[PDB]
Design an enzyme around this catalytic site. Structure first.
Site, PDB file in Angstrom:
ATOM      1  N   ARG A   1     -36.657  13.647  33.146  1.00 31.33           N
ATOM      2  CA  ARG A   1     -36.536  14.952  33.740  1.00 31.33           C
ATOM      3  C   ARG A   1     -37.025  15.777  33.804  1.00 31.33           C
ATOM      4  NH1 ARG A   1     -34.569  18.642  31.579  1.00 31.33           N
ATOM      5  NH2 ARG A   1     -33.193  18.873  29.767  1.00 31.33           N
TER       6      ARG A   1
ATOM      7  N   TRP B   1     -33.871  16.717  13.415  1.00 32.90           N
ATOM      8  CA  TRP B   1     -32.959  16.972  14.333  1.00 32.90           C
ATOM      9  C   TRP B   1     -31.841  18.131  13.218  1.00 32.90           C
ATOM     10  CZ3 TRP B   1     -31.256  15.824  19.556  1.00 32.90           C
ATOM     11  CH2 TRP B   1     -31.579  14.542  19.676  1.00 32.90           C
TER      12      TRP B   1
ATOM     13  N   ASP C   1     -42.272  17.731  27.742  1.00 34.12           N
ATOM     14  CA  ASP C   1     -43.578  18.999  26.909  1.00 34.12           C
ATOM     15  C   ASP C   1     -44.362  18.141  26.883  1.00 34.12           C
ATOM     16  OD1 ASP C   1     -45.255  19.930  25.067  1.00 34.12           O
ATOM     17  OD2 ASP C   1     -43.575  21.065  23.745  1.00 34.12           O
TER      18      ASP C   1
ATOM     19  N   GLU D   1     -35.999   7.255  14.173  1.00 36.13           N
ATOM     20  CA  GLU D   1     -34.839   7.717  14.386  1.00 36.13           C
ATOM     21  C   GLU D   1     -34.496   6.969  15.848  1.00 36.13           C
ATOM     22  OE1 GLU D   1     -37.252  10.451  17.545  1.00 36.13           O
ATOM     23  OE2 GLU D   1     -35.345  11.675  18.719  1.00 36.13           O
TER      24      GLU D   1
ATOM     25  N   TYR E   1     -28.717  10.962  22.172  1.00 34.43           N
ATOM     26  CA  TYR E   1     -28.709   9.203  22.098  1.00 34.43           C
ATOM     27  C   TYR E   1     -27.218   8.397  21.593  1.00 34.43           C
ATOM     28  CZ  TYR E   1     -32.560  11.722  25.532  1.00 34.43           C
ATOM     29  OH  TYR E   1     -32.797  12.552  26.357  1.00 34.43           O
TER      30      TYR E   1
ATOM     31  N   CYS F   1     -33.640  14.929  27.683  1.00 32.26           N
ATOM     32  CA  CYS F   1     -34.736  14.518  28.332  1.00 32.26           C
ATOM     33  C   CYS F   1     -34.987  13.406  29.278  1.00 32.26           C
ATOM     34  CB  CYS F   1     -36.235  15.147  27.316  1.00 32.26           C
ATOM     35  SG  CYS F   1     -35.331  17.202  27.356  1.00 32.26           S
TER      36      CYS F   1
END
Ligand SMILES: C#CCN(Cc1ccc2[nH]c(N)nc(=O)c2c1)c1ccc(C(=O)N[C@@H](CCC(=O)O)C(=O)O)cc1
Ligand SMILES: C#CCN(Cc1ccc2[nH]c(N)nc(=O)c2c1)c1ccc(C(=O)N[C@@H](CCC(=O)O)C(=O)O)cc1
Ligand SMILES: O=c1ccn([C@H]2C[C@H](O)[C@@H](COP(=O)(O)O)O2)c(=O)[nH]1
Ligand SMILES: O=c1ccn([C@H]2C[C@H](O)[C@@H](COP(=O)(O)O)O2)c(=O)[nH]1
EC number: 2.1.1.45
Lengths: 316, 316
Positions: A218, A82, A221, A60, A146, A198
């Protein structure tokens, strides 16, 4: 032990976390404003109290570092993190002739046979992406992820800015700068995004020849996300440093809404009955310096002795 | 005492702060990653260990809340905090026929008579702004300032987004949201800004009928800046809450590069010899609810009993 902060954050939410519902309608326990600190010179913060897949983390991150936004690369690396996002766009679009997948993510947990149909439908879509260059071009490209937020920010003049690329250049020329910031937040885009980032914003810092990095999340989990995020950003703090020829300092994870889904309570308690072992160690290829040209083989994790993997369900 | 965190941050930097130079070539003592928490239900965090001017704080915040970016409003309110920025643009532009002000800010501290010339030159420019609507239109408009970043973000399609306006609407409709974020960071603009925003990003949060707010400050002047910032953002947490009809929770100030200029050491130590008094109290007009239409008279600070003002020089 290096990962203590994560346990403390977990225990803490369990203890002071106030109930708070959300989009998925599953309740959560939340806190607002937290901040962990991981001295990266003590070791690599990959959880030992539960097996985390570093392979997916590398896959990733490299995808991001290439400014890529298409699933094809990740797929070739057996990474499926994804997939739902691409799949979801395929199902809501034209040409899709097959079993109605409306609400596949949620239903998967409930309808058993449905899970079977959906899983193969997924298997097909991925194959098409992976092989039909035309298909990949229109269903595998996630768009705003991203990869394009860090290295291809769209300007009002129809151009593109390589935030990460530039910041790196700055660390080299002006290390003591306070403007080493990369934002993944675009007010123009968030209003209509499937999922605003996030991992909202990070900033670099250099002192005493050591590079540090702070990330502003922000939303988190605590059970499923945080474990990846730490390792993901700790890897980058290592990459950029190596490139710039500095040493690694510490990773600082600041939180906005940190939560623990009610359906993860047992499992997290289960993990809290563990005693962290010595942290693993990152080994970067010394011959390569352009992180943009790094490959899976250029990153090696040594001494990773974890506890078994703790299974918990994805609440959408 | 409510303001303890600020003293601790001050003491802390003095104790663990590593030396680090910067643009102004004046050295500083810095730390990276900090986070304070002020329970806004205990009182209003306006420093009592040193007189802070709440009048300037109100003036500036209302200016932002109006989406305004011209000095004229602030000037009419005897606020001169943003004068040098306007003045600096006037001096580097055409038509300016007068004593060369090249490096006015820095030189002011050194050349006494120069300070005299510059101070009246300033006095003139401000008058022109304040009265010649044409002049104000081209020299008083700072351009990219918080006012236009929060309420008039330029989109790629030549339009404008009212971040603050929208977020407020969201707090009302979806309080438990995790996307209540206002960014002042534009990758398109920062590359060529006089001063990228230090008050980089804030996020709202609502739980138990109380509104909280976290602010991410990429860079902070512990002596001069932080004292204003706390009060400034604490006021907004009060305004938005009042409007949305919630209660006020706590203000959370997260820091990137927190520093203390070497020329402020004595003065800050001087303040650390003080014992904070009971915190003041904010009183908002109950008849008004549209914070966008609030005025100086709608905000009242009660019981503000501070220590004398501690004087320290502005190191550019
Ligand atoms: C990471 C990241 C960002 N993301 C994006 C993303 C989107 C929504 C989210 N929703 C919630 N509540 N938490 C998340 O971590 C989350 C993450 C991820 C997306 C999927 C998986 C994933 O499928 N892997 C899970 C479950 C695997 C399984 O089904 O067996 C895993 O446990 O790894 C992981 C991360
Ligand atoms: C606030 C803010 C943002 N800003 C913008 C801004 C720009 C550069 C900075 N540079 C540094 N080091 N610290 C700052 O707080 C700072 C702030 C301010 C700008 C000027 C004043 C100011 O003139 N008042 C000072 C000094 C007054 C005097 O000269 O007597 C004061 O002490 O209030 C205050 C704040
Ligand atoms: O590292 C990560 C990446 C994503 N998510 C989560 C955050 C939220 O739980 C959900 C997105 O929902 P919103 O916050 O956008 O509402 O995905 C994490 O928890 N951790
Ligand atoms: O609340 C505030 C507003 C501005 N500044 C400061 C931050 C830096 O000291 C200087 C700007 O320099 P850079 O960080 O941009 O280099 O102005 C503060 O300290 N506090």
């Amino acid at each position: 032990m290096l990962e203590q902060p994560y346990l403390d954050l977990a225990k803490k939410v369990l203890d002071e976390g106030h109930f708070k519902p959300d989009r998925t309608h599953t309740g959560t326990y939340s806190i607002f404003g937290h901040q962990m600190r991981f001295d990266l010179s003590k070791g690599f913060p990959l959880l030992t109290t539960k097996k985390v897949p570093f392979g997916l983390i590398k896959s990733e991150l490299l995808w991001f570092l290439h400014g890529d936004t298409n699933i094809r690369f990740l797929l070739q690396h057996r990474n499926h993190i994804w997939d739902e996002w691409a799949f979801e766009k395929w199902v809501k679009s034209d040409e899709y002739h097959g079993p109605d997948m409306t609400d596949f993510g949620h239903r998967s947990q409930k309808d058993p046979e449905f899970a079977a149909v959906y899983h193969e439908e997924m298997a097909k879509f991925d194959d098409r992406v992976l092989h039909d260059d035309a298909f990949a071009a229109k269903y595998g490209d996630l768009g705003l992820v991203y990869g394009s937020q860090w290295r291809a920010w769209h300007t009002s003049k129809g151009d593109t800015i390589d935030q990460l690329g530039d910041v790196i250049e700055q660390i080299k020329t002006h290390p003591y700068s306070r403007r080493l910031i990369v934002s993944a937040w675009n007010p123009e885009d968030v209003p209509t995004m499937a999922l605003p980032p996030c991992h909202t914003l990070y900033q670099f810092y250099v002192n005493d020849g050591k590079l540090s990095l702070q990330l502003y999340q922000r939303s988190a989990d605590i059970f499923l996300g945080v474990p990846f995020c730490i390792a993901s950003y700790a890897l980058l703090t290592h990459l950029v440093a190596h490139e710039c020829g500095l040493e690694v300092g510490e990773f600082i994870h600041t939180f906005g809404d940190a939560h623990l889904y009610v359906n993860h309570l047992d499992q997290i308690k289960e993990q809290l009955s563990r005693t962290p072992r010595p942290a693993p160690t990152l080994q970067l290829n010394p011959d390569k310096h352009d992180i943009f040209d790094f490959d899976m083989k250029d990153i090696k994790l040594l001494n990773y002795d974890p506890y078994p993997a703790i299974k918990a369900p994805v609440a959408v």
